[PDB]
A paper describes a structure:
Binding of a single-chain Fv antibody to Escherichia coli β-galactosidase (β-gal) is known to stabilize the enzyme and activate several inactive point mutants, historically called antibody-mediated enzyme formation mutants. We have been studying β-galactosidase (β-gal) by single-particle cryo-EM with the goal of reaching atomic resolution (Chen et al., 2013; Henderson et al., 2011). β-gal is a tetrameric enzyme, encoded by the lacZ gene of the lac operon, and it has been biochemically and structurally well studied (Dugdale et al., 2010; Juers et al., 2012). To understand the nature of this activation, we have determined by electron cryo-microscopy the structure of the complex between β-gal and the antibody scFv13R4.
Numbering used by the authors:
A (entry chain B), B (entry chain C): 3 to 1023
The structure:
């Protein structure tokens, strides 16, 4: 009766931050209740721990109030059979909302909307009579979003908030032998939502596991581990504090044993009863053991040395009541003298922020996915990850512990959408709610070695609540530093200056919360903390420009210990078309309102875990070996702090314009922080013209746990020499004929013919034989289909006049009209010479001026020479080159320049100069939100079909015009055009990326010279 | 229905620390909602604020569950008419429990006993229709102990915990015009009780006021004041931050005006909208004004300069929506360089701890009582008070603000009875509950100038919860320091070393939490904070010995800035006898179990506010003027920091053995921290024998607000000279006759006769004429009826073998038997000489040996000469002297020695040497728990009836034998004995008092010499 919906729902606990839970057990590290020490030691599975994951019955309602009392007693006819865990939006019930800042619901704390999507889950299951004789049977939900009430066998059990941490209830007295039934009612919105405003899809449900754990009556209630070291780490102390619940009987003992493999390293036994703590005594229900470990193997992301710790609760006669365990990693984390140290050396964090996202499963995580992510990261030169912005699925820590990644664990607290940001975090009334989001995290994850820093949440301004919570942590677990960026990045609530999007060299001095240039921030008066960016280098779409600038500061300034790129995966979701064809969806694609569109796609990898090209630029910049070339000696520097180059080979090689002349291989013997000298054999040197390039690669000959054999971990290339070509071509056998007309000029020579339209001034067509080559005339191009960064936050509604695109738009770039100023043909001794001039103007303003000369010679080669003039007072153009639509469509593209991957000017350090050959398909980058892409810089020669262009340029080539790109919201809607679109740039502006909501292109990468010159040679084979 | 007891009670919110309140409004400074600025300015009364204090209907139940649903709807036949506020134990419902540490209920957090005394209060009242048109009508309870549920017009309103702070609910929508009814159900025990384990009577009910406040819809929700100063305090800034609730309309304004009297000093006006705080902006519902004040009058306990601040919320057209106000005191509090400063100078805290206690009303406070207390304190040289151990009744701060006392405001948190002490305070699950006890206190009291330090609670060990809360405060209100003694007195949670019962010179090194000698504590390595004792000098019963030692350190060591004596009033309660006669009751006197007996009586004043003699010793030691005598020049030093001696006269005077020879009066002109020189007139000097004494007194000629005219604020006395008596008496005219017998020796001379019993060796009787003088023989006395300090915590059950009494008991002191060793009479030329010797022994051990000579001469004077030998190995005796029971009973006592008040050896600095004459009645000190009392030291002559004794001794005289004292638990049970009991001590051991649970008598005051000598002269007039 008092179990009635009617009664229960009445209190509206989900509209009250003063009730965060009802009858929930305390937090603690992961338990299994093994009843045999070996299983515990070997991490075998505990029969005392049962999963309730699977098929559950579910029914959706638009408001908690629309639930029928019947539900409590019996299933529902119309209840569907759903799989758990899952996100009900993933099943169709309601839509997922992709909003960033702006809260999904209306801001009226602590109220929530009356229309509040309720999901009723139920499960019928069996409890074995043995579980009811003794012990305690409790239930666990690893993640319920956002809040929920619970009934068992028609009785009300409890309530819980906090989507990202476990809620546990003792079912001990509601359970009946055999058949039991659970009724779980999950509310989408609650007062907890006010604290969960992270930039991500807004979903709901029982999205993490459900389990049953059977514990003895007298049991281990919690335990913590700690490791102290001596000056040189040659000796450690493992300290374990154990607490128990139940009746304390003198025959009770505890044994803590430390294994390393099969080998027991240390063991300790004792009975309950701690040291005197105060005037009343000590804890009789606790015991602390201390094990001495000589020459412990240390844990690090470089070498994840782990031990196993077993905690046995037994009686003195040797009888085991129960056992728990955890992996142990010996490491010390400290900030000392402005530096963050790990095991005594200073880290350089090569990290990334990662959300729990699956395109198919929404926010439900699985082992496979976790592992994939981990390996990609490790393969790509990452050390660390930040749990943006809440505690993750438990297994995560374990994997990191094991594979080796540093983890920053973060409280599930984000109130980004309040005004001001502080509003709740400065309010004592939210102190409790917040408090639980921090404390429980710590109680749960504190024993993992991978966790090296605690974070108070994200973007919730800076309030007195943070200060308190930060102090709490420091008191409770001084083993790790605390960080929080809110309120300016350097408040009293953080041990590290941890801004987001601070530029390297430029300051952004917003009122109250400026973002100084990182190099400058450190030397502000009185400042002494280390600086590590919590988010930097916004990887949204065609991005990552300038990435290297960061890497270089990091390397030059000690107190700049790296940062976390934003972010790992694109938060795109899968949708299906008219023919059961899938496609990547984003903000607002689910009729979701209000929404932030593409803003959910900032990953380095696509939702399927396939990489964006940016990923390489990272990989290379973050590489652990560094090179310098001096004469014919290569100096190698190791950035490893703990390990020796012991699975590393260096391959070297010399080549002249793509042609290999020499190769070597040399095994690296460099210690962490060491140098290795490498002298090269006498290097060949040819008479032939061209550039000679040295390229080196570090290879991992043997496979590791996260890499295959032959994995390349680093590389670098240098230009060694140049033999300039002092050779004049063979005087043409033939001579081209010029046929004039009033419409055009024709040039014929051989089967070849070229036509220039005298009215437009462009080369309108060309034939090889009877076949035409163009579909579109060759013409000047000064624009580009806007990248995400060019656009920023500019919308049709709300225009951002500062966004590059807006400027360009406003100035007429996109709609300027050419103007023939001149077009002449002249006959040279051995060639024809065409000469043109256009002016591009908009509203009587001449933006640019293009002046060319085409010169066709007996060789049947045309040489284009171009010279642009850009008005000082017009926004600098995105680019400067030509384009045209070719008639042909070939299978491959071959070029001699940077590649193989897409590379832009402020994003090309990872690319190598060489001869690349790839399929056309590979020259297009499927950024879900179409834009200019696929560029390759420093090209010297490009070959497509019978064409060959030569010079110094950047280019791109696909089946999509710039216009089509520019006009398609999703990549799935693009259609291949008639032939091949070719864009050949003499120059291209950088892509930026410091952030994606303001101009981020550094000046060095802006086409601001005024005068631009370039030349090409088009010809055939 | 869901309003039903049945439903409500179901959740058992009082057995859950996760629910501290339900539907309670936020905390804030005191509001009145004046609707006229002048009333506000002048503190007139607000018609918008109505008291519901008075006659209420009440009914008591043994368990919440025994309440009848009817109650919600209608009064109860048997409900009585009680007055509110009150403590129901004060009315008879149940008993008050006097327990210290040990919790009243059984320790099973968060559970409470099923038998849980519920008090149902109800009130029928009228609401004026106007209040319901608009605005908000809310209710306030200033104190409900311990927890409660609330209904209005049969509807459930909310719940609340925290006995010592206000709970407010919006009744706006439950109220009906005209007749309304409240039903309040108050639970004695709740999960809140675990946090309220203060050493005091355990009571319950609606013990502070009940009010109704009507506010506008658009109102002032909170406001704070702050004052900054310049280097020399010649200029200040008053800063007021105001927040409002309701709809924000551009025509809204705020005006803050500062008055000094009638004179407006400054005013400021502005509209809502603060400065940018973070990335989202500012508070639109707040405004901060800053007023400049030139040469502000500063507030201090010496001179409570106050201003009035008025906060008006109006529209721009000048229309007043509403006004609030508060008194403002300009002062700066800072710890700087190890010192605690007030307005730039370093305080010396002369303070005391005070509980809210009334012998009649239990824990209900009234203005009269508050005021009495204040004045007594100020009169007695106190500067400050500590709110042991919870927030006090609101008016308190106001009075302190006004009369001038420094206040330490303390959170209502004491978990003394847990094991270890830390148990809850270290538990994250209690963090929220604790949090509210701190935060609300601050939000409420933060604007009072008298509050200069915040305290986190008392005796709750040291947990991570404290650290967080301490940081919170520092963040929120950096204007004051925070202190907390738990966990060792010098933790990271306190800005001041604030121990309790630390001795001056001796260390008490308990494990974990030692108590170093205060002088030593300061120089412990790394230590730099100031030290102020939160409790020192346990004033239980006959106490305060050694008080001066403290005063002297305080004066010599800068970093020793004083302390808080423990405590102000005796927590005794009034009971009535068989004839409606009242008497002072204590622990366990209400059949209360378990209990701490007298432990509740440690005040300096009795519950009726009549002083214990200790009070003087304080007054004198804490005096603000200090003297030194050099020749005939008196040097006066002022300890005032801010004020000039401007109501001070110095009276001086010289006297020879009680006889006045000279007097002066001199006006003091000494500045704070200054010296004044005073040269005395040529001082007379007589030939006559005797001691010449100089005595000076400082007088307050004019009355102040807390003192009458002619109040004496200080004094000091010196001995100037001594003219020794070289005069031999006039050779006796007569000669005494000795008549022997086998039973005794008789001496006759004149009407006078003396008889010494030859079997016992004592003077058994004496006659003047036909009248006998003794009822009991004159005999040696080595014991005393144990003071509270002699006993300590020793009980009959649990004996404390270290307690003085125990030692004495065990050694046979109390039951030793005399032994005539010798008894002889001899005839001298002009006198008779008796000579005796006894041995006191117990179990064949001779404890002491007494050797006398009585010598009676022609003058009819007996001279007693005594010489004791004390065994090295026996506990030192409490005293050494004689006693006897006189037959007479006279009305007065006159003596020449220290007085006039009771004075002991380690407690006599406040006493003066002179001739005192008082009524017998005044020679007895009515300590509720009878013990040795009334002593007066340094006596040279004592007169009672026809007797006169002369020498150097300490003595006491009443109608109660030591034995009667020793055997009566309460003073009300003592009965006057046949005549007058006289105790004349050659020597007396000190009383101690550093604490009352371990030996506190300093060695200098212990009778440890072995050999003791003394002489008397008994005679008549």
């Amino acid at each position: 009766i008092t179990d009635s919906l009617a009664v229960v729902l009445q209190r509206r606990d989900w509209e009250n931050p003063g009730v965060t839970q009802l009858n929930r057990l305390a937090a603690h590290p992961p338990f299994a209740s093994w009843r045999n020490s070996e299983e515990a030691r070997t991490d075998r599975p505990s029969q005392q721990l049962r999963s309730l994951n699977g098929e559950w019955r579910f029914a959706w309602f638009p408001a908690p109030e629309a639930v029928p009392e019947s539900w409590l007693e019996c299933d529902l006819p119309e209840a569907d059979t759903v799989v758990v865990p899952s996100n009900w939006q993933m099943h169709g019930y309601d839509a997922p909302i992709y909003t960033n800042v702006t809260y999904p619901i209306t801001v009226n704390p602590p109220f929530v909307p009356t229309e509040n999507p309720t999901g009723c889950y139920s499960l019928t299951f069996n409890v074995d009579e043995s579980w009811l004789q003794e012990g305690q049977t409790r239930i666990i939900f690893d993640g319920v979003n956002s809040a929920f009430h619970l009934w068992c066998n028609g009785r009300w059990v409890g309530y819980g908030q906090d989507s990202r941490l476990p809620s546990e209830f003792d079912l001990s007295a509601f359970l009946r032998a055999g058949e039991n039934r659970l009724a779980v009612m999950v509310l989408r919105w609650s007062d907890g939502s006010y604290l969960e405003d992270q930039d991500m899809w807004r979903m709901s449900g029982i999205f993490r596991d459900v389990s049953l754990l059977h514990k003895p009556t007298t049991q281990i209630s919690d335990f913590h581990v700690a490791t102290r070291f001596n000056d040189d780490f040659s000796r450690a102390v493992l300290e374990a504090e154990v607490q128990m619940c139940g009746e304390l009987r003198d025959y009770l003992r505890v044994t803590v044993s430390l294994w390393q493999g099969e080998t027991q390293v240390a063991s300790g036994t004792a009975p309950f009863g701690g040291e005197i703590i105060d005037e009343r005594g000590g804890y009789a229900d606790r015991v602390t053991l201390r094990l001495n470990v000589e020459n412990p193997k240390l844990w690090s992301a470089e070498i994840p040395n782990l031990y196993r710790a077993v905690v046995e609760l037994h009686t003195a006669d040797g009888t085991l009541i129960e056992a728990e365990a955890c992996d142990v990693g010996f490491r010390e984390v400290r900030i000392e003298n402005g530096l963050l140290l790990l095991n005594g050396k200073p880290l350089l964090i090569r990290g990334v922020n990662r959300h729990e996202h699956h395109p198919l499963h929404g926010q439900v995580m699985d082992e496979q996915t976790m592992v994939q992510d981990i390996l990609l990261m490790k393969q790509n030169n990452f050390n660390a990850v930040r749990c943006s912005h809440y505690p993750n699925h438990p297994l995560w820590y374990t994997l990191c512990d094991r594979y080796g990644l540093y983890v920053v664990d973060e409280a599930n607290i984000e109130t980004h959408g309040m005004v001001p940001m502080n509003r709740l975090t400065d309010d004592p009334r939210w102190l409790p709610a917040m408090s639980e989001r921090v404390t429980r995290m710590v109680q749960r994850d504190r024993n993992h070695p991978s966790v090296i820093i605690w974070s108070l949440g994200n973007e919730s301004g800076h309030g007195a609540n943070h200060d308190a919570l930060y102090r709490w942590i420091k008191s409770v677990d001084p083993s790790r530093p605390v960080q929080y960026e809110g309120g300016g990045a350097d408040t009293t609530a953080t041990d590290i200056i941890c801004p987001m999007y601070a530029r390297v060299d430029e300051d952004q001095p917003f009122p109250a919360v400026p973002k100084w240039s990182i190099k400058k921030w450190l030397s502000l008066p009185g400042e002494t903390r280390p600086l590590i960016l919590c988010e930097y280098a916004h990887a949204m779409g065609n991005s990552l420009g300038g990435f290297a600038k960061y890497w270089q500061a990091f390397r030059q300034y000690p107190r700049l210990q790296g940062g976390f790129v934003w972010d790992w995966v694109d938060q795109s979701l899968i949708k299906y078309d008219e023919n059961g064809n899938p496609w990547s969806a984003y903000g607002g694609d689910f009729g979701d309102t209000p929404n932030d569109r593409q803003f959910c796609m900032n990953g380095l990898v696509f939702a399927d875990r396939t990489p964006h090209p940016a990923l390489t630029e990272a990989k290379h910049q973050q590489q652990f070996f560094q090179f310098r070339l001096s004469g014919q000696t290569i100096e190698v520097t190791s950035e490893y702090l703990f390990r020796h180059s012991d699975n590393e080979l260096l391959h070297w090689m010399v080549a002249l314009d793509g042609k290999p002349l020499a190769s070597g291989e040399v095994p690296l013997d460099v210690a962490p922080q060491g140098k290795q000298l490498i002298e090269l054999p006498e290097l060949p040197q040819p008479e032939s013209a061209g550039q000679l390039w040295l390229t080196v690669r570090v290879v991992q000959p043997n496979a590791t746990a996260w890499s295959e054999a032959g994995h390349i971990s680093a590389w670098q290339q240098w230009r060694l020499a140049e033999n300039l070509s002092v050779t004049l071509p063979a005087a043409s056998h033939a001579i081209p004929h010029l046929t004039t007309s009033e419409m055009d000029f024709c040039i014929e020579l051989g089967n070849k013919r070229w036509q220039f339209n005298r009215q437009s001034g462009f080369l309108s067509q060309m034939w090889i034989g009877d076949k035409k080559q163009l579909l579109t005339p060759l013409r000047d191009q000064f624009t580009r289909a806007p990248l995400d960064n060019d656009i920023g936050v500019s919308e049709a509604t709300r225009i951002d006049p500062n966004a590059w695109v807006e400027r360009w738009k406003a100035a007429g770039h996109y709609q300027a009209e050419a103007a023939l100023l001149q077009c002449t043909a002249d006959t040279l001794a051995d060639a024809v010479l065409i000469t043109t001039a256009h002016a591009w103007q908009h509203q009587g303003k001449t933006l640019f001026i293009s002046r060319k000369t085409y010169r066709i010679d007996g060789s049947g080669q045309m040489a284009i020479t171009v010279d642009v003039e850009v008005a000082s007072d017009t926004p600098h153009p995105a680019r400067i080159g030509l384009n045209c639509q070719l008639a042909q469509v070939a299978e491959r593209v071959n070029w001699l320049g940077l590649g193989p991957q897409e590379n832009y000017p402020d994003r090309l350090t990872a690319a190598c100069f060489d001869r690349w050959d790839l399929p056309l398909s590979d020259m297009y980058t499927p950024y879900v939100f179409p834009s200019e892409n696929g560029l390759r810089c420093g090209t010297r020669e490009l070959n497509y079909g019978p064409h060959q262009w030569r010079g110094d340029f950047q280019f791109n080539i696909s089946r999509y015009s710039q216009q089509q790109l520019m006009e398609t919201s999703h990549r799935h809607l693009l259609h291949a055009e008639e032939g091949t679109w070719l864009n050949i740039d003499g120059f291209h502006m950088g892509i930026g990326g410091d952030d994606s909501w303001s101009p981020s292109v550094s000046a060095e990468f802006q086409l601001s010279a005024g005068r631009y010159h370039y030349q090409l040679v088009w010809c055939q084979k």
